Design a protein around this ligand. Sequence first.
Ligand code: HEM
Length: 154
Amino acid sequence: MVLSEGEWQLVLHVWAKVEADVAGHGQDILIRLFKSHPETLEKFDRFKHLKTEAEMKASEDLKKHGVTVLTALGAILKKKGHHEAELKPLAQSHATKHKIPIKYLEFISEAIIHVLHSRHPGNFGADAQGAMNKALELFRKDIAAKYKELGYQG
Ligand code: HEM
């Protein structure tokens, strides 16, 4: 699948507002994921002891990881589909070390769309959401293909 230039522009336009507060978006997305799908929290030995949203919001450690997550995803998006090099080490560690099924990549994709919809309604209308969903579907499809090459079904 291939996105048009118009679709990439919708994606990068809303991402530019995300980059105004990377740590805050990183927090909201991870907390959203953990509250909506609590089984994902079990993949993080670092975090699985956090019992409540209040404890999550206070964790400087979780906030740091949100920044790492959003910075990696941002670098991928800015490649506008030319992301094979960024994707190799990410697929390797999430297949082999962390063992993250594609289903969980779908769950965090929903958290991203939900947070952007909440914080940026003016820049995340139907067309912009469609473009963002397409970009994330492309990310997941390419990561799934690498998973298969590396020997993990996901
Ligand atoms: C857009 C989706 C995601 C991106 C861009 C991303 C990115 C990253 C990056 C850059 C790291 C640090 C380096 C590395 O180990 O590769 C990391 C670590 C990690 N990721 Fe992800 N990740 C994503 C989704 C997920 C999901 C959905 C889960 C689990 C449900 C997960 C589980 C983990 C774990 C357990 C670690 C190790 C954390 C630690 O102990 O420090 N990742 N991720």
